[PDB]
Swiss-Prot record, chain A:
HAT repeats (start-end): 1-31, 105-138, 176-208, 210-245
Part of the full-length chain shown: 1457 to 1721 of 1729
Function: Involved in the biogenesis of rRNA. Required for the formation of 18S and 5.8S rRNA.
Other remarks in the entry: Present with 8860 molecules/cell in log phase SD medium.
Species: Saccharomyces cerevisiae (strain ATCC 204508 / S288c) (Baker's yeast)
Subunit structure comment from the entry: Interacts with snoRNA U3. Interacts with MPP10. Component of the ribosomal small subunit (SSU) processome composed of at least 40 protein subunits and snoRNA U3.
Localization in the cell: Nucleus, Nucleolus
Protein name (record): rRNA biogenesis protein RRP5
Curated annotation (Swiss-Prot), chain B:
KH domain sequence ranges: 85-155
GO molecular function: RNA binding
Alphabetically ordered keywords of this record: Nucleus, Ribonucleoprotein, Ribosome biogenesis, RNA-binding, rRNA processing
Localisation per UniProt entry: Nucleus, Nucleolus
Effect ascribed to mutating residue 170 to G: In temperature-sensitive mutant KRR1-18; grows normally at 25 degrees Celsius but fails to grow at 35 degrees Celsius
Organism annotation: Saccharomyces cerevisiae (strain ATCC 204508 / S288c) (Baker's yeast)
Family, similarity comment: Belongs to the KRR1 family.
Protein name from the UniProt record: KRR1 small subunit processome component
Function description: Required for 40S ribosome biogenesis. Involved in nucleolar processing of pre-18S ribosomal RNA and ribosome assembly. Essential for vegetative growth.
Chain's gene name: KRR1
Chief location bin: nucleus
Assembly, per entry: Component of the ribosomal small subunit (SSU) processome composed of at least 40 protein subunits and snoRNA U3. Interacts with snoRNA U3. Interacts with MPP10, KRI1 and with ribosomal proteins RPS1A, RPS4A, RPS4B, RPS8A, RPS8B, RPS11A, RPS11B, RPS13, RPS24, RPS25, RPL4A, RPL7B, RPL8, RPL23, RPL25 and RPL28.
Swiss-Prot record, chain C:
The protein's name in its UniProt record: Small ribosomal subunit protein uS11A
InterPro entries found in the cross-reference section: Ribosomal_uS11, Ribosomal_uS11_CS, Ribosomal_uS11_sf
One Pfam match: Ribosomal_S11
GO CC annotation: 90S preribosome; cytosol; cytosolic small ribosomal subunit; nucleolus; nucleoplasm; small-subunit processome
Family classification: Belongs to the universal ribosomal protein uS11 family.
Superkingdom classification of source: Eukaryota
PTM note: N-terminally acetylated by acetyltransferase NatA.
Disulfide bonds: none
Species the sequence originates in: Saccharomyces cerevisiae (strain ATCC 204508 / S288c) (Baker's yeast)
Subcellular location: Cytoplasm; Nucleus, Nucleolus
Stated role: Component of the ribosome, a large ribonucleoprotein complex responsible for the synthesis of proteins in the cell. The small ribosomal subunit (SSU) binds messenger RNAs (mRNAs) and translates the encoded message by selecting cognate aminoacyl-transfer RNA (tRNA) molecules. The large subunit (LSU) contains the ribosomal catalytic site termed the peptidyl transferase center (PTC), which catalyzes the formation of peptide bonds, thereby polymerizing the amino acids delivered by tRNAs into a polypeptide chain.
Misc note: Present with 29600 molecules/cell in log phase SD medium. There are 2 genes for uS11 in yeast.
Swiss-Prot record, chain D:
GO biological process: cytoplasmic translation; maturation of SSU-rRNA from tricistronic rRNA transcript (SSU-rRNA, 5.8S rRNA, LSU-rRNA)
UniProt KW Ribonucleoprotein keyword: yes
Protein name: Small ribosomal subunit protein uS15
Cross-link (Glycyl lysine isopeptide (Lys-Gly) (interchain with G-Cter in ubiquitin)): 31, 35
Oligomeric and partner information: Component of the small ribosomal subunit (SSU). Mature yeast ribosomes consist of a small (40S) and a large (60S) subunit. The 40S small subunit contains 1 molecule of ribosomal RNA (18S rRNA) and 33 different proteins (encoded by 57 genes). The large 60S subunit contains 3 rRNA molecules (25S, 5.8S and 5S rRNA) and 46 different proteins (encoded by 81 genes).
GO molecular function, one term: structural constituent of ribosome
Matching PANTHER family: RIBOSOMAL PROTEIN S15P/S13E, SMALL RIBOSOMAL SUBUNIT PROTEIN US15
HAMAP family: Ribosomal_uS15_A
Keywords assigned: Cytoplasm, Isopeptide bond, Phosphoprotein, Ribonucleoprotein, Ribosomal protein, Ubl conjugation
Amino acid sequence: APESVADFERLLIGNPNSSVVWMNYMAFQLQLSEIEKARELAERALKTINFREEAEKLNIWIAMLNLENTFGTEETLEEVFSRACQYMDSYTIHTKLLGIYEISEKFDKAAELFKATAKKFGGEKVSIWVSWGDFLISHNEEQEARTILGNALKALPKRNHIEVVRKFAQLEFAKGDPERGRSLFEGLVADAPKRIDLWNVYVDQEVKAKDKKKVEDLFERIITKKITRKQAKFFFNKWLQFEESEGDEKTIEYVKAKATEYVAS
Amino acid sequence: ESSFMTLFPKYRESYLKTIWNDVTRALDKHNIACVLDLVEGSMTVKTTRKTYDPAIILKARDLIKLLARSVPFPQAVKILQDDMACDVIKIGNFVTNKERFVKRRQRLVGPNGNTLKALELLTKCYILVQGNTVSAMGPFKGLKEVRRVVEDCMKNIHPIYHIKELMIKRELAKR
Amino acid sequence: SQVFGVARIYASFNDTFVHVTDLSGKETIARVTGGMKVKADRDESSPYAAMLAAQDVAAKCKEVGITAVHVKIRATGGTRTKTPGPGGQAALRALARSGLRIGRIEDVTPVPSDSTRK
Amino acid sequence: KGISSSAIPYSRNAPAWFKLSSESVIEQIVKYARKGLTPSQIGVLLRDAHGVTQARVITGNKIMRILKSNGLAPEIPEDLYYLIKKAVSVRKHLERNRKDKDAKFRLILIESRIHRLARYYRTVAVLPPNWKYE
RNA sequence: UAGGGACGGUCGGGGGCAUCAGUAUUCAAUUGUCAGAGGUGAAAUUCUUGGAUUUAUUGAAGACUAACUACUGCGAAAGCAUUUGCCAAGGACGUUUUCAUUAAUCAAGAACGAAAGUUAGGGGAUCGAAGAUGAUCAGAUACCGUCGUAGUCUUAA
């Protein structure tokens, strides 16, 4: 392959905008102990890429940032993010910096990047809340994760805080606490009392985390609840599929019984 | 000892020079002194040794800044009695664009001035919509009513709703 | 010869507060907020309630030892009315009438400085 | 839009205080132009320091023709060159802070103004076809 | 005294990023003091002797840029007011600089955003974020493929 300072320049005449091949050539030069020509390739990749194609420039920035996080410097990673900011939106560049810090396993730099997100993008939207929840969940403090997510949800609007709470509950069912996930699910079903979009989210999260007696019973309550025929049959069929995955034929039949009870009125 | 001061715009000096002796007679009855400076364009007011009412320097301060904010002398002197006060409503920070701002402010004024004059009659106040603020002199119930009608007029609801409910509340408090 | 408190009177609409701390403000003396002297729940912002509160404030200031008071008159401020209510004049008039010397009138109402309403 | 341009005199003559030679002007022009200087800058420096009024009056002909006859031609005409470099400067500034929509709008303007004199230069065939704005 | 481009000193609350400041508001901590304090035309829900309200010292949060602020400025319009720096840009003027008709008006198409979702009853046929399912890559909930909730539909606020 193209993996030098001569052969890569000679063989890149067909595709000068080759982002992945330029990243592989830069990593091959860095493994070949040429950090100077590696960084030269990583900086000239976005220049040999087109101007209007911002994603290729962001890929060259991520390649130089990964090379700096592996065998470079934090100043080069900040240049790579300023470069990322010179190749894209500043919040996405700082999130790429947080990802490079998480790949370099610097916990203090990861927390500082999540805090710099949770100020500006935390007052903007919920992506910084998701980033703070990701950092504190990898740090294994779900209390501080939920506190930072609630703080960023207070800083940002609250109209997407319901889906943020459902995402927090699904993440807690995935790799956190199941009682905390069920509590956040009940809080989300309280905040959306008119919408069963939190009820099906709770049922799917419990069935994903193998809480069958939770998921099928709550979905049976939702199917026999104040719903229509389609809204009852969907929840009851999902609960019956979860109950048959657990091994409960009579409960899968009683789910359809509650569906027939709620569809006829 | 106390001293306050406002500074007034240049076009007011030919009026303030005229009514200044009446200012001196309306404050020397309260035993409190005042100068106006014509070269720096200011009106200051000082508590002298013969002053036994300490609150009157605050009302004299409100008087000279009303003479700054362009309210006539016989309209302005009613601050000097106790059941009368100022309020300066701020309206500039409600809506974004200039077109809707001046249309809602002209809505606060009214066709031919009818909304503003009916509001003065109902609230027993003196109201000047001016620039991007609304000055008002009146009793404190009138100040409360004029603040709620102006701050709800900068929101979409028409102030003749408030004129209607003020007439309803007057003839509904008359039982 | 005079020893000074500070009045810290607060003439909101719907109430009047007379709260005369020492010259720092850390240590308070004789808070007699209006709506407790006489309450019909309306007259709590009235000059009569303000002068009752100021007179027994001055009684406790004289029993502690304070003979003169720097007076700070504060309206409800913020993003609201910003003008003192009916009781701010009557409170300091009653504090001056009931033997207590008055100094240094100043308005410390919170002018909101480019506030938050959008 | 405003009336802001230059006012060429009624005289097509040498200014009669201009004792300097009518060939050393051309040598000074080719000195600046092969030390690498654009023709508007040639004309304004020849005006300001080695003071000529404009060289079409004092020399035989205009200075882009002087450069072309002295073998010193530009690859691309000057107006199109400066519009190209302004477009690529604002394009590098755009591929940077992707939220400067205003600069996106004025990139639309600069490219729409590229194409006008580019197709003018194609119909005159100053620079040839198969030139398609990189 | 058509048009375009260069230069020069600039001009502007034009834009993007970063920085800095301001005092309110809200919350928390620490005191001091005690019985009430919101709010209203009156009241009430609410806050309250693990001390509220007020006062003082802080800290944190998200906004926002008071006056100055104008029949003023800038922007193609929507719009744009704290400082400083960077990134490009724009306009008027000055010009004895350059090119030489390079020009004017508007049918498709777009970036913009002032430009939206306040609470409730109801039908869900389709689609369907949220949730989950198999391979790509040191790393892939997107890519490819489906089940599937609100919503997408309606009516008043």
